[PDB]
Amino acid sequence: ENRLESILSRFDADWTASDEARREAKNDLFFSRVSQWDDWLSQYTTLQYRGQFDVVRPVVRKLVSEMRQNPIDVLYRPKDGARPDAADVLMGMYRTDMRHNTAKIAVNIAVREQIEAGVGAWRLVTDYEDQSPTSNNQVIRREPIHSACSHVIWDSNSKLMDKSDARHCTVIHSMSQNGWEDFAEKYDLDADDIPSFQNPNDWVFPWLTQDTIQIAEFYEVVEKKETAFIYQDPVTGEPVSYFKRDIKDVIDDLADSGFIKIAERQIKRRRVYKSIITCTAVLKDKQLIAGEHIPIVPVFGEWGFVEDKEVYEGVVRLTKDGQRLRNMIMSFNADIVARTPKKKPFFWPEQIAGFEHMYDGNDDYPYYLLNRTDENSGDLPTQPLAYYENPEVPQANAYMLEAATSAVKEVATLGVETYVFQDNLATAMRRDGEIYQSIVNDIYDVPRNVTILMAEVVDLATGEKQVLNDIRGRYECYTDVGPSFQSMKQQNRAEILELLGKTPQGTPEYQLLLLQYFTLLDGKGVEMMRDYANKQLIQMG
Amino acid sequence: TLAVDEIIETISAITPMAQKAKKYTPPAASMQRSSNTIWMPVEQESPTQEGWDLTDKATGLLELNVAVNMGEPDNDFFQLRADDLRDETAYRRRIQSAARKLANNVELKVANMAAEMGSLVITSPDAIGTNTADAWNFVADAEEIMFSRELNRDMGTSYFFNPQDYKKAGYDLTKRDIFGRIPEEAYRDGTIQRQVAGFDDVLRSPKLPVLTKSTATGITVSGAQSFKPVAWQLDNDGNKVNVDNRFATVTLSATTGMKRGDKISFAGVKFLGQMAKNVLAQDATFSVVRVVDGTHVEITPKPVALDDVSLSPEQRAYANVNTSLADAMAVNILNVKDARTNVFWADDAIRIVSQPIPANHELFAGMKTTSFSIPDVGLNGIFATQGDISTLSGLCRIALWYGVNATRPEAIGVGLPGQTA
Amino acid sequence: TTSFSIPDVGLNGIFATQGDISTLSGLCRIALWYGVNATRPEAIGVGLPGQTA
């Protein structure tokens, strides 16, 4: 019955369900980012040589660069039977608010975490922007998530790679003192009461972390049937459906503007609620946020289930044993070089008594001298001179260094190429496109295209606030994967060039060349060229 | 040796009482300071005066409360020895057996708690199979005693039979020389019926305690005693400390042979109709909770007398016994022979208060700890492992913190068949 | 272990925690390792007022 206890029970169940995978991913992250001698037992009273001779890191760098050279981004395409340009406005909005550095950096962070540990993630949030708003004085921006394996905890009853069937997700934030103070300032929390939550870290002795503060955001999606109002648009006259929750505070204003209700239906839809929680109390209870889906997008590497248990792997897990063997053998050989007596002769003191300065290493003599006689034994015994053996690297050491290096080289081959990882990123981007489409439909001002222009039907309430109105004919475009473009003009330029590269030299080639010059950017000479292209296009009808 | 990969399953337990028990989780931060105890008020009853002129006859207000607290953790501490030659699958099976045993223990505590502070006692002078429809009579007696007292039964009722008496009821139904639907089901299956004599859930429980007979005899109340309902009392420092309404200490001639769970009844005190304050024909039945000292015992239903002249009218509004103790009334012992107990209650009378063990804090580093959700029973504990490197060994521990509470002992009951002589 | 960042005076301390499974308890240790040295005692001084015989 207790909301706090229900949330805590759900989070605890997920936390223990995702225990082995999180610990393995964190170990991989430590191995590939901090040190390869992850000795959480060290207790070395006598410090010995432990080198770091890395052979896995170049592979990780190569994979990161390979997957960076091929960007991937959402591409909205019109559905079957919809208007041919039903996705232009959504594509423009997406390219406008996803062109910043934060989106690219979040994608890159998730990509690197996927390659190294096995899982990354990023988040989509909405904010109020007043200087350069994308639409309706609001923007949608993508933020990064570091150590997603330990910071993002999903519903354990999820059998999808992209976690679209998960009903809740807990995100743990760790922040400094100033960060907590201004997080509380932003969310109207109390800065005096310092919160706490499950610390997503357990590395014990040599890992020195920071004294931070932990809080959690618990997202839950609820699918239910809610009332919808079927109005008659004064201009078009077509039946328009509006959600009662969305148009609750402008019900009378719709009638005053001239909307007459026709009927009332119950349409099933999903809603997302965020709760700000600590380990002992709930601060914000059910703040309803935009969209139909949870705003966290995960990205996985080698992902699967073994026995009702989810396992994800990167590229570093299978190289750890070979790399550790290589490091140990290298350190042993370094010890052999360092602490091993050099090659020197074996002498009796009486053999060279008196000639001690001839053997010190100088080159001021033509030969060396030895004593021959003894006053008691008569003559010194004859014994061929012996020397200390030179240090040698054992055949076992050499063979196992070679074999460990060979094993690491053989096992550190992602694929044949990163096609599987790139397709996993593409799936994550498709899920991101779905989430962004839902959020845009919830908060942005979506114009409706008529075949008789774009109409933006909105109205204001008595509190001067404007409530956006969107018809239910909304899912007119689906999500695909294409090259990343900074703007719609650049996308059009790329499409025109792609057509030009395959069109033979006829009249369509002239048309496409004129179109490319039309879509070119602006200077002075290129301005004149584009004006000439426009003149030719107009004059050719 | 190649131990085959099959397992000879042996035991299969069921926990119906712990499953039907409602489970409560109060705030941990507050409970830590309040010493794992929390007070809950009790439904209020008000007096009534007949007449026109009531100057200086205006009563006050009184609202009583009960206290629910918690016990101590239940664990399965066990060791991963280095010299042990056993498999990993065996440790896995031990964890599974730990979960099963913890659930069984929770159910056992629930059963014992109810059977040892069930105030209502329904005794029979002969066994269940002696007479026809005797099982139905036994169930209907509990239903009637619960209805006559005007006890709240909105959430539901429950009657747990022990297996032998359940079999006796089935025999009684099957020997009817006629087959309809109830006899047909009692023949094909073992079940008598799901709802019997007004109870909406009649089950059979294999873990019901046996109430051993009591050697006590020749006992009388020493000194006339009067128990007054109250919400708080002053201490020596002058602070008001709350009073649990579900206990009263009586002074007897000698508390020899009494133990926890015995059922007593003073000769002369009758039940009351709670709300209407109408005298019943059934002698008031009390359950001794704790035998403190050689001349005092603790009975769970506080015998608030109706005829007590020392009670202020707001206190007399809480009366549930027609008379009071008068320095001479002999107390009869209702349980006279060992008998396994059938237990009936209202579904809101027994609860389980649960608390978390925050072994997931940053203070408990080194060990690795997760939650441990017991199925069947709806409870959660912790599961932690630690490793000693000096001896190259490890330890494992499954802890579970909870406490079984009986908020309304006047609603829980105990059926005692065959209590002759 | 975590760093501590002692305020005012510029110094860093170590705050560490350990747990026990036999007794469900935990130990905590905040420590600060430092040494005060007088490199120029002839530069350091002392003022004593009221040093009458």
Curated annotation (Swiss-Prot), chain A:
Source organism superkingdom: Viruses
Main subcellular location: virion
Keyword Iron-sulfur annotated: no
Cellular component, GO annotation: viral portal complex
Outcome recorded upon mutating residue 60 to A/T/M: Overpackaging
UniProt GO BP: symbiont genome ejection through host cell envelope, short tail mechanism; viral DNA genome packaging; viral DNA genome packaging, headful; virion assembly
Keywords: Capsid protein, Late protein, Viral capsid assembly, Viral genome ejection through host cell envelope, Viral genome packaging, Viral penetration into host cytoplasm, Viral release from host cell, Viral short tail ejection system, Virion, Virus entry into host cell
Location(s) in or outside the cell: Virion
Family according to the record: Belongs to the p22likevirus portal protein family.
Subunit relationships: Homododecamer. Interacts with the terminase large subunit; this interaction allows the packaging of viral DNA. Interacts (via C-terminus) with the head-to-tail adapter protein gp4; this interaction participates in the head completion. Interacts with the scaffolding protein; this interaction initiates procapsid assembly, thereby ensuring incorporation of only one portal ring per capsid. Interacts with the capsid protein.
Function of the protein: Forms the portal vertex of the capsid. This portal plays critical roles in head assembly, genome packaging, neck/tail attachment, and genome ejection. Procapsid assembly may initiate with a nucleation complex composed of portal and scaffolding proteins. The portal protein multimerizes as a single ring-shaped homododecamer arranged around a central channel. Switches upon genome packaging from an asymmetrical conformation in the procapsid (PC-portal) to a symmetrical ring in the mature capsid (MV-portal). This change of conformation may serve as a signal for headful packaging.
Official protein name in the record: Portal protein
Organism name: Salmonella phage P22
Lineage: Viruses, Duplodnaviria, Heunggongvirae, Uroviricota, Caudoviricetes
UniProtKB/Swiss-Prot annotation, chain B:
InterPro entries, A to Z: Phage_coat_Gp5
Positions of the record's site feature: Involved in capsid stabilization and maturation: 52
UniProtKB keywords: Capsid protein, Late protein, T=7 icosahedral capsid protein, Virion
Positions of the UniProt region annotated as I domain: 214-336
Gene3D superfamilies membership: 2.40.30.240
Outcome after substituting residue 232 to A: Cold-sensitive phenotype probably due to an assembly defect
GO molecular function annotations of the record: identical protein binding
Residue runs in coiled coils: none
Pfam families xrefs: P22_CoatProtein (PF11651)
Annotated consequence of substituting residue 236 to A: Slight decrease in phage production
Effect caused by changing residue 235 to A: Lethal. Complete loss of procapsids assembly
Localisation: Virion
Outcome recorded upon mutating residue 52 to N/V: Drastically decreases capsid stability
Gene Ontology terms: cellular component: T=7 icosahedral viral capsid; viral capsid; viral procapsid
Region (Binding to the capsid assembly scaffolding protein): 1-47
Annotated GO biological process: viral procapsid maturation
Positions bearing the site annotation: Essential for binding to the capsid assembly scaffolding protein: 5
Protein family according to the UniProt entry: Belongs to the P22 phage major capsid protein family.
Free-text note on domains in this protein's UniProt record: The insertion domain (I domain) plays an important role in the folding of the capsid protein by acting as an intramolecular chaperone.
Subunit structure: Interacts (via N-terminus) with the capsid assembly scaffolding protein (via C-terminus); capsid proteins and scaffolding proteins form building blocks that assemble to form the procapsid. Interacts with the portal protein.
Function comment: Self-assembles to form an icosahedral capsid with a T=7 symmetry.
Protein's recorded name: Major capsid protein
